[PDB]
């Protein structure tokens, strides 16, 4: 899928790889600041921080930074340090999202007029890539999708420089059409070469001195790694602005990275009494839907899946993470584990269930202490053997474990688990 990259990542790639006759100013003049930054070392590595005034802003995939007052503009290095004191390491809220401001970018301030601010954007659709231009960019740009000139570059077609001039740039200052045209041509070749699916620059600034990339947001098609790795390097794909990942979420992501199997875990409410461990992408969505539909949204602890034929060891490692997570605190009403899924096409149900069984066995004591009840519904290769050892580990440990086959409607166990219907 397409994944966002940081502004600094996007700018670095652009400065490194764009090919344009138009002169791009302040190339590579950026410094990254975190709460662990050694400021004497940073100054020695970016002496340019003393040569002129600066701009500082968070680089954490937050939009509308300027208009929401998250940008410190035209400051001295000390003024940047001052502006950072009450913000860096502190919580901030943007829309319905809250998180710590912990990653900032410092760049040189660029004196310019509003008339020197422009808007450019490129983005992917099934029918090709749209290129957008507007002659009035910036925080004040407004509903740019309604206003911008737009041009579709069709699949396997070329962006014609004459179209850029005769259609995209019709409203641009006549003395800037040439530099703007060269830049956009270059930007598009770069967009295509590095497998971007979204690339926005707002404002793009052009003065007598040349072109400045003041603000950048972007996504690339992450599946293109095998093509672009030579240019991308160790590209990082940051999560949305919000809370930090839990250690267990990071562990599962690392599990995921190490195989063709899909292993995903996101905690919604770590104290919720309803935990799931579902096989199948669609299935995991449907079980969550079902739980919410039946009034359980506030007790829904997690969502995720284990898919694509994971091995017994992988399922063991996934399961033991869930079992640890659900035995941190007691709930007055005990807890529920939904082990569900559709009917697999190639996952070895016997192999994966053996993994879960091993995990249940290692956590049996706390599972009894936490009054965990387990419901299981699953089909696929060797599923009969899987359901057997699962029922069996219930008897052996004294943990209540109700197992069902394809005769039971996939979501039926949710109602059983919540006491909305009887257990057959």
């Amino acid at each position: 899928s397409a994944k966002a990259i940081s502004e600094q990542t996007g700018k670095e790639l652009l400065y490194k790889f764009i090919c344009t006759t138009s002169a791009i100013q302040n190339r590579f003049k950026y410094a990254r600041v975190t709460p662990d930054t050694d400021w004497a070392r940073l100054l020695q590595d970016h002496p340019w921080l003393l040569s002129q005034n600066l701009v500082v802003k968070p680089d954490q995939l937050i939009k509308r930074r300027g208009k929401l007052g998250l940008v410190g503009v035209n400051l001295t290095l000390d003024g940047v340090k001052s502006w950072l004191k009450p913000r860096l390491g502190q919580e901030a809220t943007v829309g319905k999202a809250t998180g710590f401001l912990k990653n900032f970018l410092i760049e040189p301030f660029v004196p310019h007029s509003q008339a020197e601010e422009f808007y450019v954007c490129i983005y992917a659709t099934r029918e090709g890539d749209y290129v957008l231009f507007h002659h009035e960019g910036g925080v004040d740009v407004g509903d740019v999708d309604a206003k911008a000139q737009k041009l579709l570059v069709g699949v396997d077609e070329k962006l014609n420089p004459e179209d850029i001039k005769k259609h995209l740039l019709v409203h641009a200052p006549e003395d800037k059409k040439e530099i703007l045209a060269s830049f956009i041509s270059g930007l598009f070749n770069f967009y295509e070469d590095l497998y971007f699916t979204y690339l926005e620059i707002n404002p793009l600034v052009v003065t007598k001195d040349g072109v400045y990339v003041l603000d950048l947001a972007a996504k690339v098609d992450a599946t293109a790694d095998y093509i672009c790795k030579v240019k991308w390097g160790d590209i990082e794909f940051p999560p949305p602005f919000g809370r930090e990942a839990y250690p267990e979420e990071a562990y599962i992501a690392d599990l995921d990275a190490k195989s063709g199997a899909s292993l995903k875990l996101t905690l919604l409410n770590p104290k919720g009494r309803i935990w799931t461990m579902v096989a199948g992408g669609g299935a995991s969505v449907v079980y969550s839907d079902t739980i919410c539909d039946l009034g359980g949204v506030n007790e829904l602890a997690n969502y995720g899946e284990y898919s694509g034929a994971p091995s017994e060891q992988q399922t063991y490692d996934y399961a033991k993470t869930i079992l640890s997570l659900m035995t941190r605190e007691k709930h007055p009403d005990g807890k529920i584990l939904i082990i569900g899924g559709s009917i697999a096409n190639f996952t070895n149900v016997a192999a994966t269930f053996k993994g879960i069984v091993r995990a249940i066995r290692d956590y049996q004591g706390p599972l009894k202490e936490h009054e965990v009840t387990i419901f299981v519904r699953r089909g696929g290769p060797n599923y009969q053997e899987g359901l057997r050892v699962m029922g069996e580990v219930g008897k052996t440990t004294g943990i209540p474990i109700h197992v069902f086959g394809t005769e039971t409607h996939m979501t039926a166990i949710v109602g059983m688990a919540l006491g909305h219907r009887p257990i057959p």
């Binding site: 899928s1 397409a2 992917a124 099934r126 090709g128 699949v155 396997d156 295509e192 497998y195 699916t197 098609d221 599946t223 293109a224 095998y226 093509i227 096989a279 199948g280 992408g281 669609g282 299935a283 969505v285 449907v286 969550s288 839907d289 079902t290 739980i291 919410c292 539909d293 949204v297 898919s307 899924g341 559709s342 009917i343 697999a344 096409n345 190639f346 089909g379 696929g380 290769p381 394809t406 409607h409 996939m410 979501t411 039926a412 949710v414 109602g415």
Partner: protein
Amino acid sequence: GKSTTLFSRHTKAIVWGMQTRAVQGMLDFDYVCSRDEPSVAAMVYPFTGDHKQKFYWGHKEILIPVFKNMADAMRKHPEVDVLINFASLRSAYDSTMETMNYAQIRTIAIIAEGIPEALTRKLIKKADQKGVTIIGPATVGGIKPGCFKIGNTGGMLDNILASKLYRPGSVAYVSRSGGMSNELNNIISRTTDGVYEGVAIGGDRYPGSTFMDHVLRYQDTPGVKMIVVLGEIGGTEEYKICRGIKEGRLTKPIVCWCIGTCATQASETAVAKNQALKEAGVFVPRSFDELGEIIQSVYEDLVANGVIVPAQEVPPPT
């Protein structure tokens, strides 16, 4: 122009890749369907020289040729009109593009997950130009009971038998997931006369073929008496179904449920889609939990009105 009928009991396919377990799965399916002949005519694999591979057609032993060059395969098997492409994600683009230089091939299933979106747009562009139907990428494929099964679709014979996918029923379906495809096989076989055809279009951003592509085929296939679509939050594909019904292009009973109701643009939510389809006269259940019930309900009405006449169960061969 694109075909209405992709497969039949006479379909012959070429399989690209070294996938002997999948090929044997297809032949076991073919045998239990009482096909006259194996559905796989040949294989193509550029990483080895020509040769033959041993398979079983019932209790009999047979050899399937494996070609190094696709052209040899096409030319020696002019009867083949389906290619199933098991190429890895690094090989999937070129091999699919090359396949479409041979006009006998009307349908391509592309299995691999992880093909860059911009390469898939080029596959789509060429396919639409050539009149070729693409199922996938990132899909297990699809299945047409009694006729043809794509690669691993429908699991083991155990599953093929339990859900009676060895003979046709009257219900067609489309979904993104093959995970959910198998569940649909199961739900449909317990509540109706069974699946007529099922397709999984795959999970990529730009599928080679869309929900509406297949619903149209189903609409134009006499054997299909009702249609089931398992939709999903995101994009506006399902609205094309609404318009089709309102415009009178789509007339057969359609059941649809969009998953993702609990994900908490506005028209792209499962909630909104479910509600709009319902107002358009699509049979939409209160929730997935009632999907089987409503399918069964629509089916029983079609049986009462003589629209569906349930064939008689004949046991399958060995």
